Amino acid sequence: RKLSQYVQEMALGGPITKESQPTIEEDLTRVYKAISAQADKQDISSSTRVEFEKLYSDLMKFLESSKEIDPSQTTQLAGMDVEDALDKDSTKEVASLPNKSTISKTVSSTIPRETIPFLHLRKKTPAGDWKYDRQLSSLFLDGLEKAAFNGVTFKDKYVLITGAGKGSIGAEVLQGLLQGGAKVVVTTSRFSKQVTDYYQSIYAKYGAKGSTLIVVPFNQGSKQDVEALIEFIYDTEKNGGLGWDLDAIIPFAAIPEQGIELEHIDSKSEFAHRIMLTNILRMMGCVKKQKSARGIETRPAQVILPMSPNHGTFGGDGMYSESKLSLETLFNRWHSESWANQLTVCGAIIGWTRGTGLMSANNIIAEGIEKMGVRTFSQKEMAFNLLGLLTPEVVELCQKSPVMADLNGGLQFVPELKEFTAKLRKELVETSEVRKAVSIETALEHKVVNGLERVIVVTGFAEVGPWGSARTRWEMEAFGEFSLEGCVEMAWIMGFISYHNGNLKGRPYTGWVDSKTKEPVDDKDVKAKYETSILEHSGIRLIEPELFNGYNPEKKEMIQEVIVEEDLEPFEASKETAEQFKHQHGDKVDIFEIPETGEYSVKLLKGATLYIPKALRFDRLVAGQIPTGWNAKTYGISDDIISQVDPITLFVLVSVVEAFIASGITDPYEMYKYVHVSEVGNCSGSGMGGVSALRGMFKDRFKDEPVQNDILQESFINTMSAWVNMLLISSSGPIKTPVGACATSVESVDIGVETILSGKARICIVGGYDDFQEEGSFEFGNMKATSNTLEEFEHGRTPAEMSRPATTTRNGFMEAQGAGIQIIMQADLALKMGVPIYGIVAMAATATDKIGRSVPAPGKGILTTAREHHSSVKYASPNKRDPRI
Amino acid sequence: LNMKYRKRQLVTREAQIKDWVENELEALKLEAEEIPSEDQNEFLLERTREIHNEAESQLRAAQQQWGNDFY
């Protein structure tokens, strides 16, 4: 035990050693050499660290699946009532004579008082209770001696665990088996994203060479759910699957049931007795009924049931300890009931765990109970003893006889623990009450007294994706939160923040602060510690799903507007205005619906069977409602251009200018004093969509709701690329405009990069818009590749996730509004009064060369293997047409 | 090839283009008068500011390959 720079890093070293993967994790670690540039002392130090970590890892390829060892220093307690107002301390001292568990091996052996050891192992007693038999007490102590230094292996074990999350002891039990390499599944009651990601890192911190994990949501009580999971863990692979054998089982409890004496046999306290044995006692029964139906008799299942010694000892227990002392009948049931060739019970009575993450009862004293009586267990890593009680060469004894092992280290030997618990409680809080009463008046006794040349350069760019500007989503990639100087810029857009609050007319006197929500809550709203949690999650969680009401334009998304037709035959004689009967009389033939004339009025109306109105429908759609927007869009744009120009063109309009300030060129008339003959110019806009008013070109014509008299101008795909020209930077030169969508926005660059290598043109832009609408489904969703909830609601609830690529969980991808922009230069002019430089231009994509007979095919080796062509007929000797490189 | 090679950059160019720039204005010296010297400075402003860019672009014609159109 000589830990320093290592320690926790040394624990990572064992963790690195565990998941070996033969010749896999060698080679990546072998390229810790490779670029080992000895120019950094840090690099040279790690170079020393390189081979040593490579050494043992080379020495453990094909081995037993790691230890269970805890290299962390051993602990005890550190409860202190200090001098001043510093009352109660806490815990985690250092524990005298400890650190290493090997040092804690023999320390946990020859124990004091007048007992067998610090952790005995009794049995039946001739015709009585639990005599501390040394023979059973031998090997268990030796198993820990077979631990620490020696490893602990757990291959092919396949266990389920009831035991809940963070503070539970079964959490650390789960930590052991994945380190030991078992394939363990785990149930829980609570299921959410918060439940999910916690069971990602534990798998990510403890995935050893043969370790998989399954999280299942399942309520342990209410038996109508207990059958199916026990079925699901044993079914045929041509059914739900998971055809395992379940070699061991440890269920743990829940449900505290505190502060209630004998008088309360009423409800949800009631629910514990059904869940602490009654679902449980059927569960070990039914697993035998599952096992012996198949006939797997040579391989029984070992259970470890938690017990407790404080039966009738502590106070207002209710039914907790009292249902607990009903388990021990399982021992004598292991004779005179035919299930002994299938199961095995070995109890565990565990007592008095320190370590409040959760459920460390009376986490205060822990130390005076190590003196008045010298007895141990302020130690939270007692599961190290528990993890020995699954190991083979012990399971052999479990195949002989059941084992009662008092894992409680000797607390039962004090008489009258109850007031003895209260006695240090009633004094040490009382001792704090002394100096606390001293301290305040002493200050009160004081206080009353006083008072070259064709290289192409990335220059400017600004994406408006589903998040904010192009400075936003880099940081949201970089951090989960928004990082205040990043946060207010996100808070600028959506209009929650009301920048330029007014340098005057504040609170009647002076005072201006960049404030919020222009005139609801304009009140002075400081840029500091606020706007986190006064402009958060309401300010955050509106840019994701249900897409909205009142946005696109309404799109209720459980109410679909389909037009079914019908031709009923009752008659109406309704009314109307003049001359419009004729486009009802052109529309329908004469013999139905003669009009009349509407005397001193407009006209008149209806008649026989009429064969119309094709009324309406009410229809529900599953696949939709995933992406969204940002609830405010007008930057400094010209008003009443925006009555005609809306649906996508604003996005590319706000794109280019924010790319230009990022590329440092305000006022793009500034270019023309780098005098040309001005034959240098326009972009390469793209996107299949931009429909977004073309829906009005078809659903809003012959149906007659207000459309402006010219919509076919903004119908096209170059019309946006027209409006970047005349409404902005106003060139005369070349125009390309590809489309190439579902793989767009690159050939625009790639033919755009062909433009600039030719001397035909200079400084240019590329497109990148697309859009979502009503008709953005339906041939989407009906294309069955797009997205579909309900199995993105069902097994994954997950509105925030909804999509994780390369997972097998993918059922459909997603897309949203989006707006992306880039600009490009000849790079010699980019040295001429620099914009400045960002990137470097590499590829030349876009040639399919494959003609099957279907559409489409995602990216495996379809194309771009004509790219990187770069053939290798016989050269063997180093140093356009060029068939080599 | 794939190194910072620049050898055939410096040998077969930066010498032959270095050669007929000495040898190119002298070809104009063969047509020096031809009974101009009524418009000699005109042809200096005509012909000699052509050939310097031709001396410039031909070196840039090498600057296609050898690193910039290397393959």
Side-chain angles (χ1 to χ4, degrees), chain A residues 11 13-15 22 34 37 39 71 78-79 85 95 98 112 117 126-128 143 147-148 151-885, chain B:
Chain A
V152 171
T153 173
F154 276 131
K155 272 184 300 309
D156 302 345
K157 275 286 299 182
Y158 287 13
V159 169
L160 88 159
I161 294 303
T162 303
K166 307 325 157 292
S168 87
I169 301 304
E172 308 319 293
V173 177
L174 259 294
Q175 179 189 188
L177 273 309
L178 301 197
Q179 182 195 182
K183 290 188 175 201
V184 184
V185 313
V186 155
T187 170
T188 173
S189 81
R190 310 142 292 264
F191 182 81
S192 83
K193 182 184 173 165
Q194 168 159 301
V195 179
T196 319
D197 44 15
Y198 166 71
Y199 294 112
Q200 192 97 339
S201 159
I202 295 298
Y203 191 54
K205 207 181 151 185
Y206 291 103
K209 192 184 173 186
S211 322
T212 183
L213 172 55
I214 302 177
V215 47
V216 188
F218 157 77
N219 192 6
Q220 197 197 19
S222 287
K223 94 161 189 71
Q224 286 91 8
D225 276 279
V226 83
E227 318 99 354
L229 173 144
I230 296 308
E231 283 293 321
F232 183 55
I233 207 169
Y234 260 61
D235 290 306
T236 291
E237 286 69 16
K238 263 295 305 174
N239 204 338
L242 172 70
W244 292 359
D245 284 1
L246 263 187
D247 313 335
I249 292 179
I250 302 116
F252 281 170
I255 314 302
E257 194 190 9
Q258 59 275 61
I260 44 174
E261 288 207 12
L262 190 138
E263 324 177 16
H264 298 340
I265 65 165
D266 47 333
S267 175
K268 306 291 160 265
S269 56
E270 206 146 351
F271 203 80
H273 187 276
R274 204 212 190 99
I275 203 173
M276 282 149 182
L277 59 95
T278 327
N279 295 269
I280 299 187
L281 192 48
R282 274 167 322 202
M283 210 199 78
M284 284 81 72
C286 82
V287 166
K288 183 242 174 168
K289 310 262 211 276
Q290 197 64 244
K291 282 174 69 66
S292 314
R294 274 166 187 86
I296 46 183
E297 188 265 332
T298 174
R299 189 164 138 205
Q302 168 173 358
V303 314
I304 300 291
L305 171 46
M307 329 293 315
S308 167
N310 50 10
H311 50 278
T313 315
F314 287 117
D317 172 273
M319 312 176 80
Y320 167 65
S321 86
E322 323 292 54
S323 321
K324 264 285 209 188
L325 218 69
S326 62
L327 304 160
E328 290 85 340
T329 170
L330 263 298
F331 285 75
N332 296 330
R333 287 282 221 83
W334 197 63
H335 321 316
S336 74
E337 198 180 6
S338 171
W339 49 276
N341 277 164
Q342 265 68 39
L343 276 84
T344 282
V345 299
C346 323
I349 190 159
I350 57 155
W352 213 246
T353 315
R354 192 72 198 174
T356 293
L358 290 92
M359 224 33 204
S360 187
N362 313 268
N363 207 50
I364 301 103
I365 312 296
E367 281 168 328
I369 45 177
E370 280 202 353
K371 317 298 147 36
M372 297 176 290
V374 284
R375 198 54 260 198
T376 59
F377 262 122
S378 196
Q379 316 188 12
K380 207 218 164 183
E381 295 322 294
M382 40 76 65
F384 167 66
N385 205 317
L386 227 104
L387 262 296
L389 307 174
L390 202 53
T391 49
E393 84 92 20
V394 196
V395 189
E396 201 160 296
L397 318 168
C398 313
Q399 218 158 359
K400 267 181 190 162
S401 313
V403 178
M404 277 189 279
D406 48 358
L407 198 144
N408 168 264
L411 275 68
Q412 73 267 37
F413 298 100
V414 70
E416 208 274 310
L417 192 141
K418 200 173 184 182
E419 181 265 354
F420 190 84
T421 326
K423 183 189 153 191
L424 260 38
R425 181 164 299 185
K426 73 190 56 160
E427 181 195 74
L428 275 303
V429 193
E430 192 265 349
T431 320
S432 70
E433 205 264 345
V434 182
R435 326 201 204 278
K436 182 62 64 182
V438 162
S439 43
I440 169 66
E441 50 88 16
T442 321
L444 188 67
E445 203 188 328
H446 161 263
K447 81 165 88 174
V448 72
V449 173
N450 304 321
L452 77 150
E453 212 269 342
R454 261 171 60 153
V455 56
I456 315 297
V457 48
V458 186
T459 60
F461 81 111
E463 193 151 327
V464 187
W467 301 129
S469 71
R471 278 187 307 277
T472 66
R473 48 156 310 275
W474 197 288
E475 281 216 354
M476 185 49 216
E477 193 263 347
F479 311 95
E481 294 90 327
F482 271 162
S483 312
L484 279 75
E485 186 95 24
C487 189
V488 76
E489 200 209 6
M490 198 285 299
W492 199 99
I493 308 103
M494 309 109 68
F496 283 63
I497 288 304
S498 53
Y499 156 68
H500 297 146
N501 70 281
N503 316 277
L504 205 54
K505 31 93 222 132
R507 187 154 288 163
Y509 45 87
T510 176
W512 77 268
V513 160
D514 206 304
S515 163
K516 62 186 283 175
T517 180
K518 203 68 203 168
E519 291 271 48
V521 200
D522 45 303
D523 42 12
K524 258 285 183 164
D525 203 42
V526 81
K527 315 167 148 291
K529 68 205 76 170
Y530 307 159
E531 81 257 11
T532 47
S533 84
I534 204 166
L535 276 311
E536 273 183 3
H537 51 90
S538 158
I540 314 166
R541 299 275 87 80
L542 278 179
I543 315 102
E544 213 63 37
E546 212 50 62
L547 63 73
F548 279 168
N549 271 351
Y551 216 62
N552 318 104
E554 289 82 58
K555 203 67 186 55
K556 198 61 62 70
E557 282 289 326
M558 324 167 193
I559 306 300
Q560 283 308 113
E561 186 170 359
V562 185
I563 308 110
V564 74
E565 59 179 359
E566 67 287 336
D567 47 356
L568 85 170
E569 48 266 22
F571 321 106
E572 287 79 19
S574 55
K575 222 194 173 178
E576 84 306 336
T577 182
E579 182 265 326
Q580 318 315 312
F581 79 114
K582 264 156 170 163
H583 261 92
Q584 290 163 292
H585 193 224
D587 267 347
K588 274 78 196 166
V589 311
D590 197 31
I591 312 303
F592 318 118
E593 215 280 312
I594 55 153
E596 268 297 320
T597 180
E599 49 104 33
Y600 57 85
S601 167
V602 280
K603 280 309 281 184
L604 274 177
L605 218 51
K606 303 300 242 168
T609 310
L610 280 182
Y611 307 106
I612 210 184
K614 312 178 142 30
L616 71 158
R617 294 207 53 172
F618 298 139
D619 173 45
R620 154 80 76 85
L621 171 66
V622 182
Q625 82 258 7
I626 308 304
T628 42
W630 317 275
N631 310 78
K633 283 279 99 172
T634 287
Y635 266 56
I637 207 68
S638 83
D639 306 337
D640 78 22
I641 281 300
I642 37 173
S643 84
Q644 149 193 39
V645 307
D646 43 337
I648 56 146
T649 75
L650 271 295
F651 301 141
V652 287
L653 254 291
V654 81
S655 87
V656 290
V657 161
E658 171 61 75
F660 289 153
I661 308 298
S663 37
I665 311 177
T666 228
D667 190 83
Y669 293 90
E670 193 200 342
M671 174 50 154
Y672 297 89
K673 69 180 200 46
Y674 290 155
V675 55
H676 311 272
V677 203
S678 185
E679 40 183 314
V680 276
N682 213 345
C683 84
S684 317
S686 162
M688 184 101 97
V691 37
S692 54
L694 190 143
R695 171 185 72 111
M697 199 269 289
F698 276 148
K699 193 156 256 284
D700 200 1
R701 194 132 283 189
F702 214 64
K703 325 293 173 307
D704 205 294
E705 290 85 5
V707 170
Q708 72 170 1
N709 309 120
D710 164 76
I711 216 67
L712 221 64
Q713 180 163 36
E714 207 183 12
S715 61
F716 284 93
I717 216 58
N718 52 2
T719 169
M720 281 65 59
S721 277
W723 275 347
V724 197
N725 217 353
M726 198 44 215
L727 279 303
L728 277 180
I729 163 175
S730 49
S731 118
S732 43
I735 293 190
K736 298 300 290 189
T737 72
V739 195
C742 86
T744 174
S745 155
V746 291
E747 72 292 26
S748 46
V749 178
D750 197 73
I751 298 196
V753 77
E754 287 278 0
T755 321
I756 176 61
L757 63 86
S758 44
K760 288 187 293 225
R762 272 179 286 174
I763 325 293
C764 195
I765 318 100
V766 288
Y769 55 91
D770 35 358
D771 200 357
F772 165 69
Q773 72 280 349
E774 171 263 327
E775 267 176 329
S777 169
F778 278 104
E779 206 155 89
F780 286 83
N782 206 33
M783 208 49 106
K784 271 302 178 192
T786 64
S787 284
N788 174 43
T789 179
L790 196 142
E791 270 158 331
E792 212 65 27
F793 202 86
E794 197 48 62
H795 276 94
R797 275 79 173 165
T798 73
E801 298 184 351
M802 283 288 181
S803 88
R804 266 260 159 178
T807 48
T808 204
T809 302
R810 187 181 73 89
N811 196 40
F813 52 111
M814 265 148 72
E815 271 315 309
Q817 306 293 105
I821 200 72
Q822 301 94 324
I823 48 165
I824 47 172
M825 295 184 80
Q826 216 185 15
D828 274 27
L829 283 79
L831 200 37
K832 191 74 62 60
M833 309 301 288
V835 298
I837 311 106
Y838 263 73
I840 180 59
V841 172
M843 65 281 294
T846 72
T848 51
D849 294 359
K850 173 61 212 292
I851 317 158
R853 214 203 299 254
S854 167
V855 56
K860 313 307 171 206
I862 297 297
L863 68 155
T864 75
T865 324
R867 212 177 83 176
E868 67 202 349
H869 168 59
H870 289 69
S871 290
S872 165
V873 82
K874 62 100 184 175
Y875 57 103
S877 52
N879 315 275
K880 213 167 309 307
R881 65 287 198 200
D882 201 83
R884 316 288 85 216
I885 192 81
Chain B
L1 280 178
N2 311 119
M3 56 174 286
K4 215 170 177 176
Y5 196 81
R6 297 255 177 155
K7 292 202 59 192
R8 205 64 180 173
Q9 149 73 28
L10 288 180
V11 178
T12 198
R13 288 289 194 265
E14 316 267 2
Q16 185 146 344
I17 175 59
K18 178 203 194 72
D19 261 63
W20 68 283
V21 288
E22 306 153 337
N23 211 30
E24 193 51 50
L25 280 78
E26 199 203 320
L28 182 138
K29 295 179 82 75
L30 180 50
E31 298 86 65
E33 41 178 355
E34 312 303 315
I35 207 64
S37 54
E38 56 158 19
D39 305 301
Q40 181 259 14
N41 274 335
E42 163 188 320
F43 271 173
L44 310 191
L45 185 53
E46 201 82 34
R47 275 197 183 188
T48 69
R49 74 179 274 173
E50 305 149 0
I51 59 187
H52 178 226
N53 321 314
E54 303 321 288
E56 186 75 25
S57 214
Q58 214 272 330
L59 196 157
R60 287 324 178 280
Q63 210 53 41
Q64 262 68 26
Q65 306 194 1
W66 296 269
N68 306 342
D69 285 335
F70 163 70
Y71 44 83

